[PDB]
Design a protein around this ligand. Structure first.
Ligand code: HEM
Length: 153
């Protein structure tokens, strides 16, 4: 479980992410798609995007960054008591979208990367470790739901 101090470091930098959810969402989805191209295949709606320039110019992809970051934000603010927020997400990413857990690791590493570039002063190693611990909790609670549904993997 994160400490209260750890949750504080997480929510403090998240409050900065919220000053521009759109730009963050963009960078994060683009970094995911460049680093792990197999991830982009899972979206019929973004599959036609071939370059970074194309991805940067797509209003829809930017609309979907907002969506994803808003969902994650609602979960972060619960500081671990995220049962009702996490249940729908896992059911859908397992049974409808077909997203292995590993990809959830990839997107985590992208989020950490982008938070670092954009918020150095608020994202030292101590905030880094705290954010990692939160995104592990996330992915740990999701995996247990996947396992329930028979999709562990
Ligand atoms: C922080 C982690 C992530 C969050 C919070 C997140 C959030 C969401 C939300 C809120 C939706 C729309 C509601 C729904 O369909 O359940 C969604 C849709 C989707 N997600 Fe994720 N997601 C995450 C990770 C991923 C990853 C890593 C992949 C693929 C590698 C992925 C693939 C999908 C697909 C294919 C859809 C449907 C998109 C569309 O066609 O409109 N998601 N996600």
């Amino acid at each position: 479980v994160l400490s209260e101090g750890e949750w504080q470091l997480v929510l403090h930098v998240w409050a900065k992410v919220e000053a521009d959810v759109a730009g963050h969402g963009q960078d994060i989805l683009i970094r995911l798609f460049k680093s792990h191209p197999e991830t982009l295949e899972k979206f019929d709606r973004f599959k036609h995007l071939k370059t970074e320039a194309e991805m940067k110019a797509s209003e829809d992809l930017k609309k979907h960054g907002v969506t994803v970051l808003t969902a994650l934000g609602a979960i972060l603010k619960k500081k671990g008591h995220h049962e009702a927020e996490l249940k729908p997400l896992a059911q859908s990413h397992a049974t409808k979208h077909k997203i292995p857990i590993k990809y959830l690791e990839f997107i985590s590493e992208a989020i950490i990367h982008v938070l670092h570039s954009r918020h150095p002063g608020d994202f030292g190693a101590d905030a880094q470790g705290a954010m990692n611990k939160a995104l592990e909790l996330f992915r740990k609670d999701i995996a247990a739901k996947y396992k329930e549904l028979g999709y562990q993997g």
